[PDB]
C-alpha cells in the first residue's frame, strides 16, 4: 500500500511532466512493466472493458464519470501520455465531442478541465478557447479564463489577456476567490513585464506638477 | 494507543506578495514501425558501417539495407521477454542485442543466425557498445560487462559504476576510453585498463542516456541529461575540465556529432518532441536548426555510414530518414 | 543529545524545503545555503523564521526527551480549506568520526528525494497555507502553543515512502501523502 520512492525513480525518465501529477501505484505498476505480449493483452482487455462502459454510458445519470475513469486508465497507464498505443489524445478528443450539446454538463468543472487537458496538443488553442466560449462551456468557471488568459499572456499579448479576465470578471467565475487572486496576480506580472501596454489608471505621480499658488 | 496527537496552535504567517543554414523539415522517408515499444531505457534503433539499419519491434529485430531496400526479419524473442538493445559492430558484421531478461545475442547479419547468447546480466541489458572484438553491455542493475565475443568464457571484467540502471554507454572509437551514464544521473569515464573511474560526473540533475565522442577531437565527449535536467554538457576526457554548456530545453534522449563539420545533433523527450542542430566552437554553442521530429519523444536515432543522414524513431511508429548533411 | 540536535536541525532544513518546493511562499522568500552537500533553501522572512524557529525549539526539546514518534506537514487549500498532501517523518528508536560522515550522506540523499518528489506530485495551483502536527507520548510535556488535534490523514490519497537516515540513536524517514 507504500510505494518506494526508489521504485519510481527506476522509472522516472518515462514520467511525462503533468500539472496534475501521477498516481503513485500507477508509477509501481510502471516501474514493473516486463513489456510481454501477455501484459500488453491484460492492457488490451481493459481497454475492451472501458469501451463496453461507454457503449452503455448513456443509461448512466452521469455517464462523463465513465469517460473520467477510462481518461484516467489511460493517463495512469501510460505515465509517459501520448503514444500510438496510448491514444490519449483520441480520447481526449472523443470525450470533449461526445458532452458538447449537452445542458447538464456546460458549467462540470470535471469536463472543461479534460477541454483543458486536450487543449495542449492543438496547434491553434484560440479556437479551442472560441469554440468553448460559443458553446458557452465553461464561462461561469476561473479556470476557463486563466487558461485562455494564459495563452494570451505566453504569447506577450498582455491586452488580450486582460479582456479575457475582464469578461469572467463580468462573469463573477468561480471559485471567485480564486479567479481573484490569479486576475490580481496577472495584472502584477503585466505591470512588471510590459508596463508600457498597461492600459489602466495607475494613480501615477506627476513630478513638480505646481499643486499650489499663491496669486 | 500510547500517541497523543498535537498541533501548533499558531497560524502560519499569510504569504506577502513578491516584489520580483537551411534545413530540409520534411524527411526524406518514413518507414513503418509497428509495436515499437515506447520506454526512454530502451535503445532499439541502429545503422551499421555496411549500410544496415537494425530496428527492435517488441520481441523482434527487423533489419533494412539502404541501398538496396530489402526488409528481413533478424530475430525473434522468447514470449516472456522483449529486446532491449540493438548495436552493430564497427565492421557492421555481427549485431549485439541485449534483451529484457539481461542475456545478450550475437547474430551474424550474413547468415541472420544466432552466433551466440551471453548470460550473466540479472536485468534488462539496456545499452551496447562495441571495442573492436570487446562488447560491452549495460544493464538494469547499475552494471557494465565486457564481453570478448570470441572466447567461450565471454565475459572478462565488470564495472560497478552506478547505483541505477546504465542508460548511456560509448567506447570511443579508439578504444581507450569508455564512457557511462546513468538512470543515477551520474557520467562515468573509464580508462580501457581500469576498473577505477577516472572521472565521475554529478553535474546532471537526471539521467545520462545521451553519451557521444567527438570523433574530430579525441579526448571531446557530450553527455545529455533528462526530464529535470536538459543540459548538454561537454567534457575533456583528459583533465576533467567542463569546456561547454548548453541548456537543450527538453530531456535529451541522444546526441550525434556531425562527421563531416563542426556541429552535434540532439533529440529529445518532453516536451518538444524535437530535433536540434548545434554549431559547435570554443566560444560555445549556437542553435543552427529546430524542428519537430515526431508526434511523440524522439527516443531512438542512428546516423548513417556516410554522416549525411539522421534515422529517428518514436512511438508513433514511424521510423524516418534525415538528410542532416548537403 | 548530538542526535537530537541533528535531528531537529534536519527538521528545520526539511521544513524549509517543503515550503519552498511546494510553493507555500515565494522563491525570493528563500536563499540558498549549503548543508548536506546540498543548495538548501532557507526562509529569508523574519514572520517565517520565527515561526519556524519555535517550532524546531519544542521538537528539538521532544526529541531530547525522546517523546516524539512522528512529526507531521499538511498542506492545505485557502480556497477550499481541505487539505492536499500531507508529509509524515517517523522518527524510531534505533533496535565515530566517519559515523558523523555516513549520517551526512543519508541525510543528503533523502533530502534529494524529497525535492525529487516534484517529477509526481500535483501542482498546488491555489494559494495553500500549512500546518504542523507531531504524535508524541501520553505523558509527553505540552507547551501551550501546543494543543490537541486529530491526525488529518488524507481521504483517497496516493502515498510514497521516502529513504531513511539513521544516527546512532534515531532512524528517521518520510512519506508523503498527495491527492491526485
Redesign the interface.
Known amino acids: 500500500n507504500w510505494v518506494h520512492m526508489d521504485v519510481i525513480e527506476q522509472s522516472k525518465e518515462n514520467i511525462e511532466p503533468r500539472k496534475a501529477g501521477h498516481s503513485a501505484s500507477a508509477l509501481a505498476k510502471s516501474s514493473s512493466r516486463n513489456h510481454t505480449e501477455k501484459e500488453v493483452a491484460g492492457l488490451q482487455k481493459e481497454r475492451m472493458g472501458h469501451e463496453r462502459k461507454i457503449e452503455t454510458s448513456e443509461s448512466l445519470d452521469d455517464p462523463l464519470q465513465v469517460w473520467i475513469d477510462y481518461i484516467k486508465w489511460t493517463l495512469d497507464n501510460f505515465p509517459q501520455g501520448e503514444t500510438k498505443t496510448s491514444g490519449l489524445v483520441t480520447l481526449l478528443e472523443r470525450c470533449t465531442r461526445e458532452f458538447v450539446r449537452n445542458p447538464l454538463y456546460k458549467d462540470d468543472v470535471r469536463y472543461l478541465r479534460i477541454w483543458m487537458q486536450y487543449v495542449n496538443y492543438i496547434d491553434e488553442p484560440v479556437e479551442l478557447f472560441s469554440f468553448l466560449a460559443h458553446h458557452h462551456i465553461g464561462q461561469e468557471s476561473s479556470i476557463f479564463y486563466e487558461e485562455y488568459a494564459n495563452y494570451f499572456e505566453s504569447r506577450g499579448l498582455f491586452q488580450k489577456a486582460d479582456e479575457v479576465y475582464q469578461k469572467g470578471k463580468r462573469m463573477k467565475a468561480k471559485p471567485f476567490l480564486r479567479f481573484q487572486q490569479k486576475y490580481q496576480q496577472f495584472t502584477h506580472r503585466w505591470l512588471e513585464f510590459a508596463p508600457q501596454s498597461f492600459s489602466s489608471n495607475t494613480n501615477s505621480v506627476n513630478p513638480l506638477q505646481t499643486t499650489f499658488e499663491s496669486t | 494507543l500510547?500517541?497523543?496527537?498535537?498541533?501548533?496552535?499558531?497560524?502560519?504567517?499569510?504569504?506577502?506578495?513578491?516584489?520580483?543554414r537551411r534545413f530540409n523539415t520534411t524527411p526524406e522517408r518514413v518507414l513503418d514501425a509497428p509495436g515499437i515499444?515506447?520506454?526512454?531505457?530502451l535503445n532499439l534503433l541502429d545503422w551499421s558501417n555496411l549500410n544496415v539499419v537494425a530496428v527492435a519491434l517488441?520481441?523482434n529485430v527487423y533489419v533494412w539495407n539502404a541501398d538496396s531496400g530489402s526488409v528481413s526479419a533478424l530475430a525473434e524473442t522468447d514470449?516472456?521477454?522483449?529486446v532491449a538493445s540493438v548495436k552493430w559492430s564497427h565492421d557492421g558484421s555481427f549485431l549485439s542485442v541485449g534483451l529484457?531478461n539481461g542475456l545478450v545475442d550475437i547474430y551474424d547479419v550474413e547468415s541472420q543466425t544466432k552466433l551466440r547468447t551471453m548470460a550473466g546480466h540479472q536485468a534488462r541489458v539496456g545499452c551496447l557498445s562495441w571495442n573492436r572484438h570487446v562488447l560491452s553491455s549495460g544493464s538494469?542493475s547499475g552494471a557494465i560487462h565486457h564481453h570478448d565475443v570470441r572466447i567461450a568464457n565471454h565475459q572478462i571484467g565488470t564495472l560497478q559504476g552506478h547505483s541505477?540502471?546504465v542508460?548511456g554507454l560509448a567506447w570511443r572509437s579508439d578504444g581507450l576510453q569508455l564512457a557511462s551514464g546513468g538512470?543515477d544521473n551520474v557520467v562515468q569515464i573509464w580508462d580501457a585498463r581500469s576498473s577505477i573511474p577516472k572521472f565521475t560526473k554529478t553535474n546532471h540533475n537526471?539521467?545520462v542516456?545521451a553519451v557521444a565522442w567527438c570523433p574530430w577531437q579525441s579526448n571531446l565527449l557530450a553527455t545529455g541529461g533528462?526530464?529535470?535536467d536538459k543540459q548538454i554538457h561537454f567534457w575533456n576526457a583528459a583533465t576533467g575540465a567542463r569546456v561547454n554548456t548548453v541548456d537543450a530545453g527538453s530531456?535529451v534522449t541522444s546526441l550525434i556529432w556531425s562527421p563531416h563539420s563542426k556541429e552535434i545533433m540532439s533529440t529529445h523527450?518532453?516536451?518538444d518532441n524535437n530535433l536540434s542542430i548545434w554549431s559547435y566552437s570554443s566560444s560555445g554553442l549556437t542553435k543552427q536548426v529546430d524542428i519537430p521530429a515526431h508526434?511523440?519523444?524522439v527516443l531512438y536515432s542512428a546516423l548513417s555510414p556516410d554522416g549525411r543522414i539522421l534515422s529517428t524513431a518514436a512511438?508513433?511508429?514511424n521510423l524516418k530518414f534525415w538528410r542532416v548533411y548537403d | 543529545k548530538g542526535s537530537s540536535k541533528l535531528v531537529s536541525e534536519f527538521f528545520e532544513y526539511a521544513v524549509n524545503s517543503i515550503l519552498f518546493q511546494r510553493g507555500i511562499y515565494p522563491a525570493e522568500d528563500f536563499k540558498v545555503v549549503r548543508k548536506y552537500g546540498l543548495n538548501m533553501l532557507v526562509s529569508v522572512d523574519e514572520e517565517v523564521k520565527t515561526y519556524i524557529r519555535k517550532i524546531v525549539s519544542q521538537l528539538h526539546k521532544w526529541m531530547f526527551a525522546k517523546k516524539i514518534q512522528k512529526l507531521i506537514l499538511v498542506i492545505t487549500s485557502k480556497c477550499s480549506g481541505e487539505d492536499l498532501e500531507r508529509w509524515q517523518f517517523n522518527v524510531e528508536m534505533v533496535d565515530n568520526k566517519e559515523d558523523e560522515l555516513r549520517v551526512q550522506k543519508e541525510i543528503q540523499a533523502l533530502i534529494a528525494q524529497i525535492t525529487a518528489t516534484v517529477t509526481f506530485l500535483p501542482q498546488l495551483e491555489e494559494q495553500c497555507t500549512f500546518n504542523v502536527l507531531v504524535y508524541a507520548d501520553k505523558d509527553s510535556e505540552v507547551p501551550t502553543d501546543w494543543v490537541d488535534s486529530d491526525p488529518r490523514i488524507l481521504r483517497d490519497a496516493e502515498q510514497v515512502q521516502l529513504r531513511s537516515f539513521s544516527t546512532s540513536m534515531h532512524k528517521i524517514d518520510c512519506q508523503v501523502a498527495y491527492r491526485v
Do not use: H
Open positions: 500510547n500517541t497523543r496527537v498535537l498541533a501548533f496552535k499558531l497560524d502560519a504567517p499569510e504569504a506577502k506578495k513578491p516584489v520580483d515499444i515506447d520506454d526512454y531505457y517488441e520481441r514470449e516472456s521477454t522483449y529484457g538494469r541505477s540502471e542508460c538512470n537526471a539521467a542516456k533528462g526530464t529535470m530531456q523527450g518532453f516536451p508526434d511523440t519523444r512511438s508513433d511508429e
